[PDB]
Coordinates of C-alpha atoms and ligand atoms in Angstrom, one line a residue:
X24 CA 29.6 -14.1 0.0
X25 CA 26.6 -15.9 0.9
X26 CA 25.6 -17.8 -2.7
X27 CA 27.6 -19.2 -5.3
X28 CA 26.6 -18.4 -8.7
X29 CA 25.5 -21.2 -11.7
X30 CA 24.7 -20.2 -14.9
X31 CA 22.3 -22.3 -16.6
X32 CA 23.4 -21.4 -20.3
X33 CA 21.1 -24.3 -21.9
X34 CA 18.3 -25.0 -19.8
X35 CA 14.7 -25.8 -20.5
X36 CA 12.1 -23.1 -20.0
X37 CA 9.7 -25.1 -18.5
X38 CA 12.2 -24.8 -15.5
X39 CA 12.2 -21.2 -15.5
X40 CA 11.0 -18.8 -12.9
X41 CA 9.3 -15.9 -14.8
X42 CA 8.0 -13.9 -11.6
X43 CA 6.1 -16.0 -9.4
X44 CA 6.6 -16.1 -5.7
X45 CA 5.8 -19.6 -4.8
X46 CA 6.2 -22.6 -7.2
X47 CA 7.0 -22.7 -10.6
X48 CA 4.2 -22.2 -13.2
X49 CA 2.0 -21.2 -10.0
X50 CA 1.2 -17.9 -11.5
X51 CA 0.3 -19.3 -15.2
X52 CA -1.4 -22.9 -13.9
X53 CA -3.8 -21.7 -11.4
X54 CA -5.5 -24.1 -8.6
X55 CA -6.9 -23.4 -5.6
X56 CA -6.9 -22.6 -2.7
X57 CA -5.0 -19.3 -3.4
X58 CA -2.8 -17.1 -0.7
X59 CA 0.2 -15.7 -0.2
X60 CA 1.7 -18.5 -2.1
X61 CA 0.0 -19.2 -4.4
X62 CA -1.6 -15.8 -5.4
X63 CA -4.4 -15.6 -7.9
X64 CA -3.8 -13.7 -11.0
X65 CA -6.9 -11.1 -10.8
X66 CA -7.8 -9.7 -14.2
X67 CA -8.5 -5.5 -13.9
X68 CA -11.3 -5.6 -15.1
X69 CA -11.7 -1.3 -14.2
X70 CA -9.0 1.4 -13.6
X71 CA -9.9 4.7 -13.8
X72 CA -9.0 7.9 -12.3
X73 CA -11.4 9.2 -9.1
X74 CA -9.6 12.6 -8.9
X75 CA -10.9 15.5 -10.7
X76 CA -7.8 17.6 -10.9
X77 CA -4.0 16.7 -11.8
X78 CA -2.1 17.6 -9.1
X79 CA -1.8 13.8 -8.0
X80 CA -3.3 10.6 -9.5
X81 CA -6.3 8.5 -7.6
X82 CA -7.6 6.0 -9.1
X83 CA -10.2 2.8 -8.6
X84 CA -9.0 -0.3 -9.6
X85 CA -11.5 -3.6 -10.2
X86 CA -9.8 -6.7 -9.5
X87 CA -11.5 -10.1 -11.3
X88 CA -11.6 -12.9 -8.7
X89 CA -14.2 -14.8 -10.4
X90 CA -13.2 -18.7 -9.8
X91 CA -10.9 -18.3 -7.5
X92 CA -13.1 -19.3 -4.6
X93 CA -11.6 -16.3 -2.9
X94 CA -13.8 -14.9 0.1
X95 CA -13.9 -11.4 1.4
X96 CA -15.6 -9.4 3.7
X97 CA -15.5 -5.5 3.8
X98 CA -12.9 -4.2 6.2
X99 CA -10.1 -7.0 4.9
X100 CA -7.1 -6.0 2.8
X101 CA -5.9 -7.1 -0.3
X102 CA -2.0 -7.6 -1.0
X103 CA -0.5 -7.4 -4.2
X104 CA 2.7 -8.6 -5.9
X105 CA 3.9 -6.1 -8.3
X106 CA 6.8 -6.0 -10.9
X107 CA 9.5 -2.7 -11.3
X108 CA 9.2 -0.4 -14.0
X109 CA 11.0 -2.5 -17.2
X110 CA 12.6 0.4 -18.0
X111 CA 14.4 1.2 -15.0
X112 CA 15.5 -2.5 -14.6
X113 CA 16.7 -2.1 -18.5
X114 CA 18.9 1.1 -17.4
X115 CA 20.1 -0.9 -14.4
X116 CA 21.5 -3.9 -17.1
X117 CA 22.8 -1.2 -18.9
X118 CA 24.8 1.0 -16.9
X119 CA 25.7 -2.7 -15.4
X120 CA 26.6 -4.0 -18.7
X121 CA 25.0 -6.9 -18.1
X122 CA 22.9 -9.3 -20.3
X123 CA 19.8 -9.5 -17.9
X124 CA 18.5 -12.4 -20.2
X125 CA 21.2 -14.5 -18.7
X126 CA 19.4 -17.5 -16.8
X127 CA 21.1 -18.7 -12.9
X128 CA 20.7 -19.6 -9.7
X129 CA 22.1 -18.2 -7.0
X130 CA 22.9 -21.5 -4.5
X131 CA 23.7 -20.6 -0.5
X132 CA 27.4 -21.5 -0.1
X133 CA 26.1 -23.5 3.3
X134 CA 24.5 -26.5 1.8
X135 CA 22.4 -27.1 5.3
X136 CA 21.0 -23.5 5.0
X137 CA 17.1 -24.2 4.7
X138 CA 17.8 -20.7 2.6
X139 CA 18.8 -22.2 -0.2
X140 CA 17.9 -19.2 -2.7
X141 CA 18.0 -15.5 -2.3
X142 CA 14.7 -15.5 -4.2
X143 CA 13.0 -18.4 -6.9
X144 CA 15.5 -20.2 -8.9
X145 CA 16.7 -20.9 -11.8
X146 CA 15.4 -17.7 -13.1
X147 CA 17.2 -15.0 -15.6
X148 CA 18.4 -11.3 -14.2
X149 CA 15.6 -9.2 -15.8
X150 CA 13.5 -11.4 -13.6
X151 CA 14.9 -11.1 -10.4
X152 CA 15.4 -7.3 -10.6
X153 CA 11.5 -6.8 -12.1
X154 CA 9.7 -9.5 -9.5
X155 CA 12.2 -10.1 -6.2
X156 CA 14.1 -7.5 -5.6
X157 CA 13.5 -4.0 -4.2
X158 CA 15.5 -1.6 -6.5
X159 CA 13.5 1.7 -5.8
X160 CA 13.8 2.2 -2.0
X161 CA 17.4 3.4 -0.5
X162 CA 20.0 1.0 -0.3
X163 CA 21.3 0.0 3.2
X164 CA 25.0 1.1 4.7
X165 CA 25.6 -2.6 4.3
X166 CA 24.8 -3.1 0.8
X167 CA 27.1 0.6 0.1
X168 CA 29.8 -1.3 2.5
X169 CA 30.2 -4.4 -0.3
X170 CA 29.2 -2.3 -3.3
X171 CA 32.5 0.0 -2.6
X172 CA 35.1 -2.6 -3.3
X173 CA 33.6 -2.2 -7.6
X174 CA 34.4 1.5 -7.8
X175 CA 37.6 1.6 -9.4
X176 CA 37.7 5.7 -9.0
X177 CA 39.2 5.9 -5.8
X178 CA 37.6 9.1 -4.6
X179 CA 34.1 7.8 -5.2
X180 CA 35.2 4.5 -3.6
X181 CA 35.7 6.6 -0.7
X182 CA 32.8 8.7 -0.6
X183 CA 30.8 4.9 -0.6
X184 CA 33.3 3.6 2.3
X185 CA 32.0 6.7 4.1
X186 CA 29.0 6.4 4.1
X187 CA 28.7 2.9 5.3
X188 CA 30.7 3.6 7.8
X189 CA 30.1 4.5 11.6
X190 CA 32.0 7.9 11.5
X191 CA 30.3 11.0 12.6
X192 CA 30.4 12.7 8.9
X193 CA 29.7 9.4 7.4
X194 CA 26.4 9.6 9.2
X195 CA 25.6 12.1 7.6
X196 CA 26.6 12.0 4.8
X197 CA 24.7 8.8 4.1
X198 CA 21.5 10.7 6.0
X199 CA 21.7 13.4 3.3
X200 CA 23.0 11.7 0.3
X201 CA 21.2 8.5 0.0
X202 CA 18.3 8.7 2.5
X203 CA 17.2 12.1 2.3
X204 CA 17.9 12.5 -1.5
X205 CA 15.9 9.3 -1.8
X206 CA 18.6 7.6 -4.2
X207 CA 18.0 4.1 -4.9
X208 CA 20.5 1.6 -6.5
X209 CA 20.0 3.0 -10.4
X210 CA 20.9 6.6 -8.6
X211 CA 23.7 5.8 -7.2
X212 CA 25.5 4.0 -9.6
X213 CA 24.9 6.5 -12.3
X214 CA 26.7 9.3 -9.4
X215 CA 28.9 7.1 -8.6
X216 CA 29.7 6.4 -12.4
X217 CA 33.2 4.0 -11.5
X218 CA 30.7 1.5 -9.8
X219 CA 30.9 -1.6 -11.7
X220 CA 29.6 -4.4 -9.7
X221 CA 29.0 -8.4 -11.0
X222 CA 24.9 -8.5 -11.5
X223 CA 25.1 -11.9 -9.4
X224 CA 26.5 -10.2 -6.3
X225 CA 24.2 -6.8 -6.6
X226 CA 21.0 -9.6 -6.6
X227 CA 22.3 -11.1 -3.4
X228 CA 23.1 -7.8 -2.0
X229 CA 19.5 -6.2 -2.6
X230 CA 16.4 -6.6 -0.3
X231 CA 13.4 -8.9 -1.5
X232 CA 10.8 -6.7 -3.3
X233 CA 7.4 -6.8 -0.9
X234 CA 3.7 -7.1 -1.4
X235 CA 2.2 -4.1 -0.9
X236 CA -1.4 -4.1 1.2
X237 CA -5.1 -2.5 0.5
X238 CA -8.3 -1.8 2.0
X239 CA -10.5 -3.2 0.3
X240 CA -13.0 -0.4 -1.2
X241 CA -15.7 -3.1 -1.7
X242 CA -18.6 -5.2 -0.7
X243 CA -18.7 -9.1 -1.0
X244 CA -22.3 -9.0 -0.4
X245 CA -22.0 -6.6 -3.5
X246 CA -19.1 -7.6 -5.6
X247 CA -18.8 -11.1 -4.2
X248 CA -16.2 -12.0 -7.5
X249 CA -14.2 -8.5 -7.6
X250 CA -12.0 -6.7 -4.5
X251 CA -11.5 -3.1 -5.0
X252 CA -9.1 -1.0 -4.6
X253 CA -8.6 3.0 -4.1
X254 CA -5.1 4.4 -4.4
X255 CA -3.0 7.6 -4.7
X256 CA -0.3 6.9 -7.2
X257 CA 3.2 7.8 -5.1
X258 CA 5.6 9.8 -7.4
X259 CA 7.9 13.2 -6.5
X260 CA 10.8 14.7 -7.3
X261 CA 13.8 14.2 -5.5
X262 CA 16.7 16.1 -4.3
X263 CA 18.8 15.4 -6.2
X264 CA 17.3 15.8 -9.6
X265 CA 15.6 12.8 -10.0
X266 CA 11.8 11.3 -10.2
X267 CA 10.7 8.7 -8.0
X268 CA 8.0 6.5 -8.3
X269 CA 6.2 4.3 -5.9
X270 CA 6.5 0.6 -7.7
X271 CA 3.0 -0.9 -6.5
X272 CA 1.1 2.2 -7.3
X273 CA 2.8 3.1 -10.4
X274 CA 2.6 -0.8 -11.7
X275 CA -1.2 -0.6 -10.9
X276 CA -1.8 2.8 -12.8
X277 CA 0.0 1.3 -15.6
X278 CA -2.7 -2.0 -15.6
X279 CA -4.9 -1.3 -18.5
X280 CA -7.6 -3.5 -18.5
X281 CA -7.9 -3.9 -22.5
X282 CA -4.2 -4.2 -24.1
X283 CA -3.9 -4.3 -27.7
X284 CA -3.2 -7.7 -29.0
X285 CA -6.4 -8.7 -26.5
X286 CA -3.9 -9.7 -23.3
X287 CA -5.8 -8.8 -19.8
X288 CA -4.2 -7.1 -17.6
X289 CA -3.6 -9.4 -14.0
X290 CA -2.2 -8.7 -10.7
X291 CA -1.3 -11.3 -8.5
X292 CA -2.8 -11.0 -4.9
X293 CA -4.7 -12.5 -1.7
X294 CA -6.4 -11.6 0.8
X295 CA -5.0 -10.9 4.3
X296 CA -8.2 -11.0 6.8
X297 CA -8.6 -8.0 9.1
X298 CA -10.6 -7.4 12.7
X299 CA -12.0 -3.6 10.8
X300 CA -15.7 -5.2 10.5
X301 CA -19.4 -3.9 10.6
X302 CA -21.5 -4.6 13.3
X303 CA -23.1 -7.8 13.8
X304 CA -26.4 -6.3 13.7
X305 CA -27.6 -4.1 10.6
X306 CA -29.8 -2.1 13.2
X307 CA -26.0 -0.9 15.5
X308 CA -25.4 2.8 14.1
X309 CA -21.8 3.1 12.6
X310 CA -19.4 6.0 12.4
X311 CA -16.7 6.5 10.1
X312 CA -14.1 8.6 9.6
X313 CA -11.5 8.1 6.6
X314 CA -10.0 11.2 5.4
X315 CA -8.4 10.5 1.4
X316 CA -7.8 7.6 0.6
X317 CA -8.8 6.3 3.8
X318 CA -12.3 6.1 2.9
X319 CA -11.8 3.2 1.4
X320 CA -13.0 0.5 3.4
X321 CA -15.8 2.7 4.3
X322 CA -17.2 2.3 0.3
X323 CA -17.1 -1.3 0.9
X324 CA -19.4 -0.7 4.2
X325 CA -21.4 2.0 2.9
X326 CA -22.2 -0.4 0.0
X327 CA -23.1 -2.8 2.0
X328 CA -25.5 -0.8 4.1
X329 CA -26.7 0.4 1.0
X330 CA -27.4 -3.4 0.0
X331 CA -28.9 -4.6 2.8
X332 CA -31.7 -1.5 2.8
X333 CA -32.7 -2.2 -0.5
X334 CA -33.2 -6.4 0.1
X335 CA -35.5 -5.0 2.9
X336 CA -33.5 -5.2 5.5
X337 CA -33.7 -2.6 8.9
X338 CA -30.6 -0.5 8.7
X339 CA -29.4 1.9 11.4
X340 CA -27.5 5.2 11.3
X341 CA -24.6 5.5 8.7
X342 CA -22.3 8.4 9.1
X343 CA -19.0 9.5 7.0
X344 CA -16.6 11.8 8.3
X345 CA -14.5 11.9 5.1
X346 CA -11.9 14.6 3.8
X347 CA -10.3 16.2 1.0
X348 CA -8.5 18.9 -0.3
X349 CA -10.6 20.5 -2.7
X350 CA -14.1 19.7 -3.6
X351 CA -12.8 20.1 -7.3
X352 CA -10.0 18.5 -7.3
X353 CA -9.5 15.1 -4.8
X354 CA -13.4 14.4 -3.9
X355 CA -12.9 11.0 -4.0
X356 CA -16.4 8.6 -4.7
X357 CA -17.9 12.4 -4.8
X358 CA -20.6 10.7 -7.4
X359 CA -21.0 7.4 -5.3
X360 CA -21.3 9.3 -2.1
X361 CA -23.7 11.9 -3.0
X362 CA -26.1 9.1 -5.0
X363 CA -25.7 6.8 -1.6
X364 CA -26.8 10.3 0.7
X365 CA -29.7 10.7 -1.7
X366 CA -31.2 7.4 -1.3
X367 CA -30.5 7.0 2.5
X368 CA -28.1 4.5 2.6
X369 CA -25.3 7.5 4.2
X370 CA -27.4 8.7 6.9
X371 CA -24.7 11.9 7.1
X372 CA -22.3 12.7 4.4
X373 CA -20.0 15.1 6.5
X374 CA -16.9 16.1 4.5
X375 CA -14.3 18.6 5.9
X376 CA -12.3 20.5 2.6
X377 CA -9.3 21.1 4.1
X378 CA -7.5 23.4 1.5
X379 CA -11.3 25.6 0.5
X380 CA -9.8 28.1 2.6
X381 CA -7.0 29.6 4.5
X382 CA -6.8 27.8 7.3
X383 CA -7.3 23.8 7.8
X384 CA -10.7 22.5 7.9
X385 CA -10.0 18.7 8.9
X386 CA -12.5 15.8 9.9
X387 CA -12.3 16.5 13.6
X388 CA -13.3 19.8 13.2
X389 CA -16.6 18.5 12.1
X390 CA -16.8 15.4 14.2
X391 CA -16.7 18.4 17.5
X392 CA -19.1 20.1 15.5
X393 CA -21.4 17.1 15.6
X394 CA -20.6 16.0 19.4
X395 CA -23.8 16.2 20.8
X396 CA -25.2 13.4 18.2
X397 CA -22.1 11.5 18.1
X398 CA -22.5 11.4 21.6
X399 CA -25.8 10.1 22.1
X400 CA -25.1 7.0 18.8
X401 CA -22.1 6.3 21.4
X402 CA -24.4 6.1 24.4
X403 CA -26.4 4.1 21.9
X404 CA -23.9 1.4 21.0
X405 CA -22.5 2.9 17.8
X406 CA -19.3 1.5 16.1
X407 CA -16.6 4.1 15.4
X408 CA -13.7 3.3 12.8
X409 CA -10.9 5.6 11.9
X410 CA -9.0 4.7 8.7
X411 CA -6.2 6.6 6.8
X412 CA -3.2 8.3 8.1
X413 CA -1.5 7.0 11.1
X414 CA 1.0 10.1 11.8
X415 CA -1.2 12.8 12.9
X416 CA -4.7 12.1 11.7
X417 CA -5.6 9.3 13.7
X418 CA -4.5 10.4 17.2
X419 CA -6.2 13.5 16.7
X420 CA -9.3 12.0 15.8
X421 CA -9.3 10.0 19.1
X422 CA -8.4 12.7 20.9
X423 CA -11.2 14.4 19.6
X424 CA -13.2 11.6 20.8
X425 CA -11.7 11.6 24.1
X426 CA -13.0 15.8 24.8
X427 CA -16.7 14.8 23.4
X428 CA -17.0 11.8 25.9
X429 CA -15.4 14.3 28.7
X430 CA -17.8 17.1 27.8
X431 CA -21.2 15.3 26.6
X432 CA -20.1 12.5 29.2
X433 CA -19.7 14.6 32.3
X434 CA -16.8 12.8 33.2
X435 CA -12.8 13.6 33.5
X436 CA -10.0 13.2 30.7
X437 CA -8.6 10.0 32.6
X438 CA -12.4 8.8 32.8
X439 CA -12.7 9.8 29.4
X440 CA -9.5 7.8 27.6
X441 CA -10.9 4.9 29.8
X442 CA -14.3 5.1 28.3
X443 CA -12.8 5.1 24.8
X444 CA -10.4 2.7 25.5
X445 CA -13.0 0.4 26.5
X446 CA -14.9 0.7 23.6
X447 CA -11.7 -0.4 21.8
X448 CA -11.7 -3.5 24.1
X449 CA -15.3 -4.4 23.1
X450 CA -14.9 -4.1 19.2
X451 CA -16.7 -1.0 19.0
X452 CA -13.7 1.6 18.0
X453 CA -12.0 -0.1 15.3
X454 CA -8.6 1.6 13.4
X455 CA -7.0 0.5 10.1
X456 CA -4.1 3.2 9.7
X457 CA -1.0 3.2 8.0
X458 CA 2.1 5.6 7.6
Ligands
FAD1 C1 -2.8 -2.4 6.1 C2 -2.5 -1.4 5.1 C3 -3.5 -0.9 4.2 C4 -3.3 0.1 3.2 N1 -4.4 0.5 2.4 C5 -4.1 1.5 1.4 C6 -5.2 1.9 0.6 O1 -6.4 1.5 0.7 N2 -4.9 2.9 -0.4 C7 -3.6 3.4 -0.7 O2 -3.4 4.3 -1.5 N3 -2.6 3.0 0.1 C8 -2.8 2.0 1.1 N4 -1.7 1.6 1.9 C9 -0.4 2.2 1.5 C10 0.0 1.0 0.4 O3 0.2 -0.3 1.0 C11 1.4 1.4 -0.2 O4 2.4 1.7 0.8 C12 1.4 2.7 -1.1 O5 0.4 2.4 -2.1 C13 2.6 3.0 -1.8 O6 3.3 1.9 -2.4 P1 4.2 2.0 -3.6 O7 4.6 0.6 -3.9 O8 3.5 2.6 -4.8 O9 5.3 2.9 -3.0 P2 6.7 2.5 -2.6 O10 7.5 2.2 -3.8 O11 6.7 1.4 -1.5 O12 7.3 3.8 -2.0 C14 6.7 4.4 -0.8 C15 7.8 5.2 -0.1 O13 8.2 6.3 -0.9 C16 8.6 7.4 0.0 N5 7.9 8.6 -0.4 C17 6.6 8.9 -0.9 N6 6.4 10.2 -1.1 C18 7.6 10.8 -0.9 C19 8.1 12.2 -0.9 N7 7.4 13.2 -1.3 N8 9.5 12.3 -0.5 C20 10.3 11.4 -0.1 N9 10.0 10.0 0.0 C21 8.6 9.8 -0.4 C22 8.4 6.9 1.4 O14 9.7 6.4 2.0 C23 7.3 5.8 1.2 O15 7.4 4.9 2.3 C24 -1.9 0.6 3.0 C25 -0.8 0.1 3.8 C26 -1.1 -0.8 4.8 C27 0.1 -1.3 5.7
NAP2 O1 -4.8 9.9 0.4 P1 -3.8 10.7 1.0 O2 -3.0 10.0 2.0 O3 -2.8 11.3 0.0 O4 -4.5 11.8 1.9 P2 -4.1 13.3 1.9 O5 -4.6 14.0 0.7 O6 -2.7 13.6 2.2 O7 -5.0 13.8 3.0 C1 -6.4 13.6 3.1 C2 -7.0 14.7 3.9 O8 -6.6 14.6 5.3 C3 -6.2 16.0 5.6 N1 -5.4 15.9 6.7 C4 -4.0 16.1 6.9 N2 -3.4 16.0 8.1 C5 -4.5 15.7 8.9 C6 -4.8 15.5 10.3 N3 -3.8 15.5 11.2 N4 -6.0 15.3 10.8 C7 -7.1 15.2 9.9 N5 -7.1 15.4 8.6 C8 -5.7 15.7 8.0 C9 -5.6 16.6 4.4 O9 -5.5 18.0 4.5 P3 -4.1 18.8 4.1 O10 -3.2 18.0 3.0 O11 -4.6 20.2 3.4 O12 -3.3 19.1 5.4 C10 -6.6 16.1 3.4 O13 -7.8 17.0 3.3

């Protein structure tokens, strides 16, 4: 294998790695500048649910930045560093039967290796498996290739061999069985029941756990000390009999601002700066479309349009394509929109309910609805950003951009994706999407 393993049986705990990412007592002595190594430990100071119904969980989170000379703009995203469920990281030590308390490094065999750690060292197993390594997401063939060796039933050894392998059946079998089912390592080895591997080598086996990234849902001109964030809480059921839950979005739900015992809540994070900006110029119309929870950045600019019109400042057009569901049940901001209609800061508040009826009623739809004004703010310089979905929602939009230049512009399809893709050239059709 790659590392060696040392157990530190006696060593002091001001040596200790207890979750941070970058240097040791980073997290709990914090100095600035902050980023992605040296993330600042945001107190939430608001979590709270946005959706109205309970088929899924949205919430708003409030993130603390005061003092940490952090800047933001609206449009940026915000990364965050979160920790695995304790409990499943206690089953995992269990069905192990190891003693995750145990403190080690794990030292790269090659001495030269500029990797000289799978992850921050000396540090104990509960650690590693709750702040650096990914233990929800579907192992890799390779990882099943060295895990087989530990299953001392031969038939489930096997199954394991086949499915890291290249075989035709193996293929598919791993497709179906790990993939598909969505097992992750706790999964398996409770199917797979003979599967006794050494904690040390299942550490070095597993994939670093990632920061997960935001938009932004808010204002610096607003909330120059707190980033906020919108998020649907990821969590299913699985093929195979099991609940799954999303680690970044479940961590975040669970961050309760208060915590008996007094203890605040924190979340380490930075801020990763983005091109997805207002215009220049208050007066330059903007048109958004963010369908769930891809109006998020689009809070952040509405609140800033909304700010600058009430310092006294000339504001031009501000329109939101947004979408749900159900008007009673995902409306997301439906309070905060509405008040921000009323007072004039969103010029339009267009919102396309997608399930209200039999058929789909999707952003588009109204954006086609509204092509002869949309056309004329494009004529007249108007920004257009698309956030959300990158699948299917965001190519439709511009396509649906594409047919109201061609009609309203008098000009072919080819004359028409040129058009658009100019305006993508100049800064003036912006797109934040993700899958
Ligand atoms: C630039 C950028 C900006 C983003 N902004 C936002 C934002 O503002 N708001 C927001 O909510 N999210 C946003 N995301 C998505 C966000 O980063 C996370 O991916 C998301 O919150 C889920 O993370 P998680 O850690 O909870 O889920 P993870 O533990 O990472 O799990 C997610 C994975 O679970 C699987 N999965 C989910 N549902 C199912 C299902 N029914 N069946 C089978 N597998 C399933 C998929 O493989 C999915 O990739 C953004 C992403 C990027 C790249
Ligand atoms: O947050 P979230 O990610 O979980 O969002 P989401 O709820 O999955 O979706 C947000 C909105 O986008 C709609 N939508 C789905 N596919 C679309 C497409 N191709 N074009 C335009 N709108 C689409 C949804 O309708 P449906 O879910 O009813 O298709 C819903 O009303």
């Amino acid at each position: 294998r790659q590392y060696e393993l040392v157990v530190h049986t006696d060593i002091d705990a001001a040596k200790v790695y207890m979750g941070e990412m970058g240097r040791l007592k980073s997290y709990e002595n914090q100095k600035p500048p902050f980023d992605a190594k040296n993330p600042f430990l945001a107190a939430v100071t608001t979590n709270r649910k946005l959706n109205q119904g309970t088929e899924r969980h949205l919430m708003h989170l409030e993130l603390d930045i005061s003092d940490s000379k952090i800047r933001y703009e609206s449009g940026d995203h915000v990364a965050v560093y979160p920790a695995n469920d304790s409990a499943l990281v206690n089953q995992l030590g269990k069905i192990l039967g190891a003693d995750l308390d145990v403190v080690m490094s794990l030292n790269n065999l090659d001495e030269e290796s500029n990797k000289k750690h799978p992850f921050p060292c000396p540090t104990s197993y509960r650690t590693a498996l709750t702040y650096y390594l990914d233990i929800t997401n579907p192992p890799r063939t390779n990882v099943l290739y060295e895990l087989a060796q530990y299953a001392s039933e031969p038939s489930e050894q096997e199954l394991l061999r086949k499915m890291a392998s290249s075989s035709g059946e193996g293929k598919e079998l791993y497709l179906s069985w790990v993939v598909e089912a969505r097992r992750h390592i706790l999964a398996i080895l409770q199917d797979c029941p003979s599967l006794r591997p050494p904690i040390d080598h299942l550490c070095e086996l597993l994939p670093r756990l990632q920061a997960r990234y935001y938009s932004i849902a808010s204002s610096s001109k607003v909330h120059p000390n707190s980033v906020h964030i919108c998020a649907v809480v990821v969590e299913y059921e699985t093929k195979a009999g099991r609940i799954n839950k999303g680690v970044a979005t479940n961590w975040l739900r669970a961050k309760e601002p208060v915590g008996e015992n007094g203890g605040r809540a924190l979340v380490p994070m930075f801020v990763r700066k983005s091109q997805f900006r207002l215009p220049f110029k208050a007066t330059t119309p903007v048109i958004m479309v963010g369908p769930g929870t891809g109006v998020a950045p689009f809070i952040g600019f509405i609140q800033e349009r909304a700010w600058l019109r009430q310092q006294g400042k000339e504001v031009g057009e501000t329109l939101l394509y947004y979408g749900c569901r159900r008007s009673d049940e995902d409306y997301l901001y439906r309070e905060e929109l509405a008040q921000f209609h009323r007072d004039g800061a969103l010029t339009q508040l267009n919102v396309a309910f997608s399930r209200e009826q039999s058929h789909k009623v999707y952003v588009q739809h109204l954006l086609k609805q509204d092509r002869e004004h949309l056309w004329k703010l494009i004529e007249g310089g108007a920004h257009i950003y698309v956030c959300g979905d990158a699948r299917n929602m965001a190519r439709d939009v511009q396509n649906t951009f594409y047919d109201i230049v061609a009609e309203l512009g008098a000009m072919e399809h080819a004359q028409a994706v040129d058009y658009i893709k100019k305006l993508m050239t100049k800064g003036r059709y912006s797109l934040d999407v993700w899958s």
